[PDB]
């Protein structure tokens, strides 16, 4: 996350290390995102930088439009599929890993998001919360 954060995020269980491939939820013409970095991640020997829901990552478009491929761009994780605990203790998880493509400040490249998004990402990013249909 970092710059465009609107408040804090309680710790979500990390489920997306680098090298992971998630789906592209928005209509920016990309199909999948390939995670190469996690913003705000710490430094430990041999530990992969792992991303959770709501975190801003650096990703490349492995499959999609050639205007988007072969370059690094910021993305935002909106669906995790690794079970995490909320403070009301419900363990929840989606059925797929999914993110959207955004600018470094948080404004989305696309305009609409398919599928649900996590509210722990919606509250952190309002532009994701704007184009989100259903927020769970």
């Amino acid at each position: 996350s970092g710059n465009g954060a609107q408040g804090t995020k309680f710790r979500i269980s990390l489920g997306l290390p680098v090298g992971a491939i998630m789906n592209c939820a928005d209509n920016s013409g990309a199909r999948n995102l390939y995670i190469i970095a996690v913003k705000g991640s710490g430094s430990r020997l041999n530990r992969l930088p792992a991303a959770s829901l709501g975190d801003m990552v650096m990703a490349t478009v492995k499959k999609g439009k050639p205007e988007l491929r072969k370059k690094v761009m910021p993305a935002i994780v909106v669906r995790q599929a690794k079970s995490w605990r909320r403070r009301d203790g419900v363990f929840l998880y989606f059925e797929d890993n999914a993110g959207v493509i955004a600018n470094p400040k948080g404004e989305m490249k696309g305009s609409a998001i398919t599928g649900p998004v996590g509210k722990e990402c919606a509250d952190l990013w309002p532009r994701v919360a704007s184009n989100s249909g259903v927020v769970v």
Partner: protein
């Protein structure tokens, strides 16, 4: 606090118990335990599992 109902077995889910599962069609399922969760992800039908509330309703047991 709310006591939710199991989306597979109709059991009562107390706070901090069981799991939740959001499917790609934005539908929310709730499981009291890994038994019902694994049966759900095995795609079993609750009307054929003899201990489910749906089964007992369908067979008029305790009805």
């Amino acid at each position: 606090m709310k006591v939710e109902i199991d989306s597979f077995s109709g059991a009562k889910i107390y706070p901090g118990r069981g799991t939740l599962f959001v499917r790609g069609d934005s539908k929310i399922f709730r499981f009291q335990n890994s038994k019902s969760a694994s049966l759900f992800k095995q795609r079993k039908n609750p009307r054929r599992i003899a201990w489910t509330v749906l089964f007992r309703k369908h067979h008029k047991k305790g009805i």
